[PDB]
Amino acid sequence: VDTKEFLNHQVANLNVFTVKIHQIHWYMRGHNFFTLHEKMDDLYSEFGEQMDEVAERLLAIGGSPFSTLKEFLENASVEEAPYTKPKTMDQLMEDLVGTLELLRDEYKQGIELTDKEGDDVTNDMLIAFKASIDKHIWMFKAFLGKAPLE
Amino acid sequence: VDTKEFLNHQVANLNVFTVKIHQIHWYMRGHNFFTLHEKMDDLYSEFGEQMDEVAERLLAIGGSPFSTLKEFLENASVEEAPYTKPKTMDQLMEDLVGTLELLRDEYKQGIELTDKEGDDVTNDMLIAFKASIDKHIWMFKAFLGKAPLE
Amino acid sequence: MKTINSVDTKEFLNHQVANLNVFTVKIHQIHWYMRGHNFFTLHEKMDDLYSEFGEQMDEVAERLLAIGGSPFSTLKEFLENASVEEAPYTKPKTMDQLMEDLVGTLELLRDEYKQGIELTDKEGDDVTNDMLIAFKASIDKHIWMFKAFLGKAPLE
Amino acid sequence: VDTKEFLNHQVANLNVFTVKIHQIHWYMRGHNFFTLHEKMDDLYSEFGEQMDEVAERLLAIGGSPFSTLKEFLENASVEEAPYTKPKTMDQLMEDLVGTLELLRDEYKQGIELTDKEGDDVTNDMLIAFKASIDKHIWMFKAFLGKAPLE
Amino acid sequence: VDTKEFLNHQVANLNVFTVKIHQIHWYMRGHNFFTLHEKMDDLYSEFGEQMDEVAERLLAIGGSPFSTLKEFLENASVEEAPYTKPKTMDQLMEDLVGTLELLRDEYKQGIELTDKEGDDVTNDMLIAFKASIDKHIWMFKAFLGKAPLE
Amino acid sequence: MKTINSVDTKEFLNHQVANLNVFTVKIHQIHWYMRGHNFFTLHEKMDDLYSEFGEQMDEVAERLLAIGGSPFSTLKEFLENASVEEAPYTKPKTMDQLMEDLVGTLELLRDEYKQGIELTDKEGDDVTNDMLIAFKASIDKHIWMFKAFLGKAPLE
Amino acid sequence: SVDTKEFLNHQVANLNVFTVKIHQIHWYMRGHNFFTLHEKMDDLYSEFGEQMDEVAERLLAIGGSPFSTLKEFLENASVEEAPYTKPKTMDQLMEDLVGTLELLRDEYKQGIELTDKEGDDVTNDMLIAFKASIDKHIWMFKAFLGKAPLE
Amino acid sequence: SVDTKEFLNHQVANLNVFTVKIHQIHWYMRGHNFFTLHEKMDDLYSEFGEQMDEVAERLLAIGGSPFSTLKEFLENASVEEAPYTKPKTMDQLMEDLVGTLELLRDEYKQGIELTDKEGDDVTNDMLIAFKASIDKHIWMFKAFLGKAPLE
Amino acid sequence: MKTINSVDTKEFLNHQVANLNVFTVKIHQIHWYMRGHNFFTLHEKMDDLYSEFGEQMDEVAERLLAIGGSPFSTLKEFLENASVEEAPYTKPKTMDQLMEDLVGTLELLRDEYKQGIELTDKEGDDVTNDMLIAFKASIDKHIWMFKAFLGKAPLE
Amino acid sequence: VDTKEFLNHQVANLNVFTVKIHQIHWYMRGHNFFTLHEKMDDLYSEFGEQMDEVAERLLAIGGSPFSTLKEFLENASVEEAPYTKPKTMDQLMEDLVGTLELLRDEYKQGIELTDKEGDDVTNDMLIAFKASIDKHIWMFKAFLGKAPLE
Amino acid sequence: VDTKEFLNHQVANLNVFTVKIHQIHWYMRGHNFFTLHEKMDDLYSEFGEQMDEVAERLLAIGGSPFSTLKEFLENASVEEAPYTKPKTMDQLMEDLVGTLELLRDEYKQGIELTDKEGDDVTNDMLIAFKASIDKHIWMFKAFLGKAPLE
Amino acid sequence: MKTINSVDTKEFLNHQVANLNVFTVKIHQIHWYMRGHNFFTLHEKMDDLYSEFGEQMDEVAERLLAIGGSPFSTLKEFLENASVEEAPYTKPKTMDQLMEDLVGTLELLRDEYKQGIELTDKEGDDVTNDMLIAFKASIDKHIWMFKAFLGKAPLE
Ligand SMILES: [Co+2]
Ligand SMILES: [Co+2]
Ligand SMILES: [Co+2]
Ligand SMILES: [Co+2]
Ligand SMILES: [Co+2]
Ligand SMILES: [Co+2]
Ligand SMILES: [Co+2]
Ligand SMILES: [Co+2]
Ligand SMILES: [Co+2]
Ligand SMILES: [Co+2]
Ligand SMILES: [Co+2]
Ligand SMILES: [Co+2]
Ligand SMILES: [Co+2]
Ligand SMILES: [Co+2]
Ligand SMILES: [Co+2]
Ligand SMILES: [Co+2]
Ligand SMILES: [Co+2]
Ligand SMILES: [Co+2]
Ligand SMILES: [Co+2]
Ligand SMILES: [Co+2]
Ligand SMILES: [Co+2]
Ligand SMILES: [Co+2]
Ligand SMILES: [Co+2]
Ligand SMILES: [Co+2]
Ligand SMILES: [Co+2]
Ligand SMILES: [Co+2]
Ligand SMILES: [Co+2]
Ligand SMILES: [Co+2]
Ligand SMILES: [Co+2]
Ligand SMILES: [Co+2]
Ligand SMILES: [Co+2]
Ligand SMILES: [Co+2]
Ligand SMILES: [Co+2]
Ligand SMILES: [Co+2]
Ligand SMILES: [Co+2]
Ligand SMILES: [Co+2]
Ligand SMILES: [Co+2]
Ligand SMILES: [Co+2]
Ligand SMILES: [Co+2]
Ligand SMILES: [Co+2]
Ligand SMILES: [Co+2]
Ligand SMILES: [Co+2]
Ligand SMILES: [Co+2]
Ligand SMILES: [Co+2]
Ligand SMILES: [Co+2]
Ligand SMILES: [Co+2]
Ligand SMILES: [Co+2]
Ligand SMILES: [Co+2]
Ligand SMILES: [Co+2]
Ligand SMILES: [Co+2]
Ligand SMILES: [Co+2]
Ligand SMILES: [Co+2]
Ligand SMILES: [Co+2]
Ligand SMILES: [Co+2]
Ligand SMILES: [Co+2]
Ligand SMILES: [Co+2]
Ligand SMILES: [Co+2]
Ligand SMILES: [Co+2]
Ligand SMILES: [Co+2]
Ligand SMILES: [Co+2]
Ligand SMILES: [Co+2]
Ligand SMILES: [Co+2]
Ligand SMILES: [Co+2]
Ligand SMILES: [Co+2]
Ligand SMILES: [Co+2]
Ligand SMILES: [Co+2]
Ligand SMILES: [Co+2]
Ligand SMILES: [Co+2]
Ligand SMILES: [Co+2]
Ligand SMILES: [Co+2]
Ligand SMILES: [Co+2]
Ligand SMILES: [Co+2]
Ligand SMILES: [Co+2]
Ligand SMILES: [Co+2]
Ligand SMILES: [Co+2]
Ligand SMILES: [Co+2]
Ligand SMILES: [Co+2]
Ligand SMILES: [Co+2]
Ligand SMILES: [Co+2]
Ligand SMILES: [Co+2]
Ligand SMILES: [Co+2]
Ligand SMILES: [Co+2]
Ligand SMILES: [Co+2]
Ligand SMILES: [Co+2]
Ligand SMILES: [Co+2]
Ligand SMILES: [Co+2]
Ligand SMILES: [Co+2]
Ligand SMILES: [Co+2]
Ligand SMILES: [Co+2]
Ligand SMILES: [Co+2]
């Protein structure tokens, strides 16, 4: 693994994640609908911007971002599933949180890799993204009645 | 074909199209880079909003939008291809225009279908989207040195 | 008059002036009396709806003026003509009961607007037709979202 | 009459008044149409906000606001009449001014009542509303060519 | 007639109309000067935007808009006359209203024409423009002390 | 010490500087530790309250300066003088429990502000009297809304 | 440079009398055009108050000392004022406003010639800009009165 | 109601003298605190000009007739003015400003008692709000001078 | 007729009312018919110019009113008096050709405004003189920038 | 020490510091009053935001922030004292600068600590806060006529 | 000296002046630090804009602006010196005022020159700049306790 | 001094103060003299870069102040110390040549900032290190975009 391969893997992950955010946005039901429906728009924008920043950082270090759905599905470690039967709001937020934790943990691996390779800019970028992910994990775990690392 | 099936087909198309817009945004080169790079961000936002409006109109008429990359690829008539060898700006804009024309022509079919079924709201929505697509076709054809229907 | 048998764009629009005035007062009733854990979100949401349907009401009344009509403009007339129903708040209602009343009235307006859409189409009043379709688009979106709050599908 | 009863009476009055403002807004004709049509929108907003503040102050002191057209008509002292025959702009503004004077004088009674009962917050709220009403009375009387209190 | 010919006729009409609006803006006198002078600026912007939208819709369906004063005069049904003698504010507003009614009635013909030809986008555009014209006719007739269709 | 025995306006205002500093820290405690389905709404709502009561505190302190007083300005002084109580967050609290603590403190401030309104009216300090009434107006509105969240009437 | 200084100071005095007159009209006007003209006077009050500050601060920048008391304004202004004793019609109030605008126009024209003769390009340019606005106001308020700008 | 009317009109006169004094300070000040206090005077000019318009329009709304000429302001104001003849230090200018703020504070206190006695709740409330701001300014400008607010 | 023979300021300004109305229509012609790789930038740029020269036109007309004149106010009058030329769009023009036509018209207006500056200076109309200088300043900047687009020096 | 303990210590410090900022804001006198009174409002907001960011970072790593005045006093190394006698503006600013230097030096220790523990996000947060403190130290030292590290 | 040579001389002057403004911005100390540090940013922006407008006016009259530090130093009459020993705030403001006076007096020569040559646009531009310089001279002299021209 | 052998954070930062002043003047050179069909877009783009790198320059100088240094503050010193090169504009340059000069200078700054990033890391100046990384991130993005304009890959 080198930095280019890591960033491209995250281009794929973030495209799967933003589509998942839309799935949750569209299908959610329950008393917290109005608040969490809007919250998903905030996350969609934020992680869409993460995705563009990752892709353009990859461009700037001489790489070539994945840029088709086929490539995203071939490379993403984030999982997706069609919405077939009704899920509770908690179940949807557990799927969201689980994907946030996955991104956190993979970003930590990219932070270590970019440090080893001496790519200070990419390292810094990933740290800033992790800071936001860690905050989201605390808040969505709190919604679920749980501690952030529980 | 009924209105629900038509709208869901366009959810799939618009997700393939916005990813294609990003492909063009990222990989373009040439003297018009700064203008068209920004222009692609405008289109990305606009057609992303079309997509959300289509999906939520589908929800509001009792339908269930596709919400995974797998479903989008299974259903889209918009085509995608990985970016492997360098394309000129004109070639990228021809791919863009060709997809705009496809969406125009399929939206016209949805306009006829929703009129036949008496779904006035969906009909009106599609007409408004076609108005913007037709304007884009004129402008991007003009960039290419061509008439809008040439 | 009954919208379902309604024959006349002017009559239909005036009926909706009455309806929308009853509806905005109902939105305030819900805004004021609601209790429960979703209070802060739904209290503000009712302010959004109050503004939106008040604007619908002004647009309907002024479209009626523009086609040569005379809008109802007193509480007496609104009560004499509205098919939207109201009731004084006497005993406690749960948030779900309040939202069910809201959704039921949205469905009534949706269905009456669809009657007006057909009527204006047949009479060739393209502007009024287009106006009502835009209003229905918003109502349909609200019905989906408030049904979702209630744990239900939009047309369930 | 205690403070709760007084405030509820004004909830009723203000709902009759805002409908009257719309009657004037809709039916007015004459050379001052454009200015006064917009001015009525300003008043409609202002007295609608007074109405909500009165109702919510009533809630905060343990009361229950009237919340139906039926209740507003049964309790309002503000008068209304359907628009049957043409009225001049001056006649419409005379009706507006007459109602502003009614509200002014009733708010003065409410100011005295709340001072007697020790409800400092409600007292302060009513004084602020009267301040605006007094200003409107001066300006609309001036429009009519008259002194504010003549 | 076909849709292209109709739209080009309105390009000509709207260019004559915006100049007429400026004529009224510049030469008006009377007590309502300040309000109506500014109101004509509002109309000038609005109908200038209608004109650009009509011309660019014409482009988008493969047409070629008139684009010279000579062509506008050769094709407009809206009439113009030099300001050679004093006119009252009522006379100027009667001229404005008459031209609004002419445009309303021609847009109605274009609405019927585009419906028959199946040009849903152009049909929708013309309806939106008629909606605004109908509102202006009510308001300016009210200024003149008249009912909208009087 | 006790606001019910406040000798004068200066002492009363300084007591509220102390109270409001304890209260804004309690608002942060609730903001940070809350959990439950209403988290996103109430977490933001606590930021609104923190700003508002922080501004009340600065206004009280600067009014005290303007009448020749000297505001408390250390944590030690705030703790020596506040009647608002605080406790470290040890065992978990439900969202409703946190909101009950918030409402209880709002009621305490309401009732002490009422004492200060009566005191300043007696002393003829019209400006301070008016300031306290405006603050009470907001507190009364908050009590209604947070009681509604809890499913209760405002004075229940 | 004393002639330019004296001219600018005379206009500090004029503009302070004028803004008070604008308030007089703003406060006492009655009639059907009240709402439009009441607000219009607020626009004029702001604009001519800003002219006044610009004039005074230009005077400072060329080494002068602006009049800065009501007593001095009255001792020096050529703009006239009168207490409001009996009601005036809206047209009468607008005629007074227009007359004062014409007075300022004509005195500024004198100041434009004076500053050109003295070679004070900055002050000359400032006065031309003010006259441009005054000329526009004269056209618009004359039109309100049913009149041509210079008739 | 004539006592409330007379009080408000007296304050129309005072505030017109005061805003001109604020301009005097704004224009003539010199010293190291120039940039901050020059801008601060613009804030005060706007605020007390708005108080003046609010006072005059409240007077109109209770049936009164505001003074509306420099002559009337001078005949009635208790705020004093003096031509700027010899340079003053920045501290001296701020002492004059503070003294005038204290004058307005104390007269408003009288007006607050008067309107309470006459039962004019609206005017009473307006004056209290103005006094609140004046009291804050007195604290801040006294602090600038190194002094306590009431010392 | 010819600005080089303009008898007075009123006649000159009215000639420019005519010129600017022909010019804004030409700007729209270019805006609508342009094709080529610089389309998106120059299509928007023509909207900027249309607004700016439309404002110049209104300023010229209202200055003419303020000095006792009577602006041309019909297409017929504009065509009878303009020295700016127009032609229908028939055969295709390149973007560079359209920009050459634009620059040529800017140069015409520059040179006529210079005549009006000299005329108003002679007549002592300081306000109109100043207005025309400000307009020339913008035209000179546009000539530099559009000549640069064409690969040329401003006065080449 | 570990990262959680360090961050909680700074929650305590920052709550003592914001109260000290208010002390200076309220009691300052002298010719620089207007500028420095407003400047303390800027600092109050900034360090209040640092405090919330520190507390919420602590939450996001599984910690529990101090949340009472009692705990803040038990744990802060920033010192406070009642305002009992007149201080010059220089004295107040010397107290401010001394506390900024204390915070700078403790943040340096936390930067080293979080680096050693591998908490990249917390490390990055503390560096950004130190950057602002270092700038303030230069500017307030300049106010006092001193070099930044004098 | 013709207009082109004069304008180019001021391009050089203004580049030396903006660097001097930064020197003062960076090195100033004393009780007026916060106010004057920000004031220097205002001046830096203003005279940078003057410089660009001068250069672009020179372009529009067929000239070629100096565009290197070497050229600016060879042509500027504004003087510069490295900051070697401490200067008081008053000394720094005296240097600023002295340079403003230099620019004022040179712009006056340029105003005379452009009037002689008939360059009305350049003449007008220089007068506007002098207007601002004259205002700054009054205000900074006032800061120093002096009359504007003494 | 030579950044590549640079030993001292203060020396490195001051060297970049000099560089950034030469660079912003070069950006103006390009802004003023450019010609060609991309004029309107790249003329504005140079304004963006001028503001951005001027802000970098102020941030570098003030970081140097904050660590006890003394920024160069005269054109003489900037020329004595900059490694960024400048040349008078004498003969015409194509837009591509101007953009090649821009890109070459961006690459020089990138590579010198990387030297400063390593130096500040070794010295333990975390704040200066973080500042330089943020600046490099922007420079790297510009290099990609301007190379794309030139038809080249970012590191080609
Ligand atoms: Co992979
Ligand atoms: Co919620
Ligand atoms: Co919310
Ligand atoms: Co982005
Ligand atoms: Co992007
Ligand atoms: Co892989
Ligand atoms: Co960073
Ligand atoms: Co749960
Ligand atoms: Co399909
Ligand atoms: Co381009
Ligand atoms: Co662009
Ligand atoms: Co959306
Ligand atoms: Co959505
Ligand atoms: Co299918
Ligand atoms: Co539509
Ligand atoms: Co091509
Ligand atoms: Co009916
Ligand atoms: Co019936
Ligand atoms: Co509306
Ligand atoms: Co309306
Ligand atoms: Co149908
Ligand atoms: Co039809
Ligand atoms: Co529509
Ligand atoms: Co439920
Ligand atoms: Co009753
Ligand atoms: Co409200
Ligand atoms: Co409400
Ligand atoms: Co009753
Ligand atoms: Co009448
Ligand atoms: Co109040
Ligand atoms: Co025709
Ligand atoms: Co009239
Ligand atoms: Co009017
Ligand atoms: Co108006
Ligand atoms: Co446009
Ligand atoms: Co257009
Ligand atoms: Co008439
Ligand atoms: Co059809
Ligand atoms: Co439509
Ligand atoms: Co339609
Ligand atoms: Co009439
Ligand atoms: Co106590
Ligand atoms: Co505050
Ligand atoms: Co404060
Ligand atoms: Co509960
Ligand atoms: Co109050
Ligand atoms: Co009160
Ligand atoms: Co004189
Ligand atoms: Co000013
Ligand atoms: Co000033
Ligand atoms: Co004299
Ligand atoms: Co008349
Ligand atoms: Co000028
Ligand atoms: Co008196
Ligand atoms: Co006001
Ligand atoms: Co007023
Ligand atoms: Co007296
Ligand atoms: Co002193
Ligand atoms: Co009040
Ligand atoms: Co001619
Ligand atoms: Co204009
Ligand atoms: Co105009
Ligand atoms: Co070419
Ligand atoms: Co000028
Ligand atoms: Co001039
Ligand atoms: Co510790
Ligand atoms: Co000092
Ligand atoms: Co200061
Ligand atoms: Co300041
Ligand atoms: Co926050
Ligand atoms: Co927080
Ligand atoms: Co000292
Ligand atoms: Co590490
Ligand atoms: Co960072
Ligand atoms: Co780092
Ligand atoms: Co010192
Ligand atoms: Co030279
Ligand atoms: Co500029
Ligand atoms: Co430039
Ligand atoms: Co030379
Ligand atoms: Co000194
Ligand atoms: Co000028
Ligand atoms: Co070096
Ligand atoms: Co060496
Ligand atoms: Co900066
Ligand atoms: Co700086
Ligand atoms: Co390293
Ligand atoms: Co280290
Ligand atoms: Co950073
Ligand atoms: Co190339």
From Swiss-Prot, chains A, B, D, E, J, K:
Subcellular location: Cytoplasm
Catalysed reactions listed for this entry: 2 Fe(2+) + H2O2 + 2 H(+) = 2 Fe(3+) + 2 H2O
Binding site residues for Fe cation 2: E56
UniProtKB keywords: Cytoplasm, Iron, Iron storage, Metal-binding, Oxidoreductase
Recorded consequence of changing H37G: Slight decrease in DNA protection and significant decrease iron affinity. Retains only one third of wild-type DNA protection and loses iron-binding ability
PROSITE patterns: DPS_1, DPS_2
Keyword Oxidoreductase carried by entry: yes
Upregulation: By iron limitation and stationary growth phase.
Enzyme Commission (EC) number: 1.16.-.-
GO terms for cellular component: cytoplasm
MF annotations from Gene Ontology: ferric iron binding; oxidoreductase activity, acting on metal ions
GO biological process, one term: intracellular iron ion homeostasis
Origin: domain of life: Bacteria
Functional summary from the UniProt entry: Protects DNA from oxidative damage by sequestering intracellular Fe(2+) ion and storing it in the form of Fe(3+) oxyhydroxide mineral. One hydrogen peroxide oxidizes two Fe(2+) ions, which prevents hydroxyl radical production by the Fenton reaction. Does not bind DNA.
Subunit text: Homododecamer. The 12 subunits form a hollow sphere into which the mineral iron core of up to 500 Fe(3+) can be deposited.
Protein name per Swiss-Prot or TrEMBL: DNA protection during starvation protein
Species per Swiss-Prot/TrEMBL record: Listeria innocua serovar 6a (strain ATCC BAA-680 / CLIP 11262)
Recorded name of the encoding gene: dps
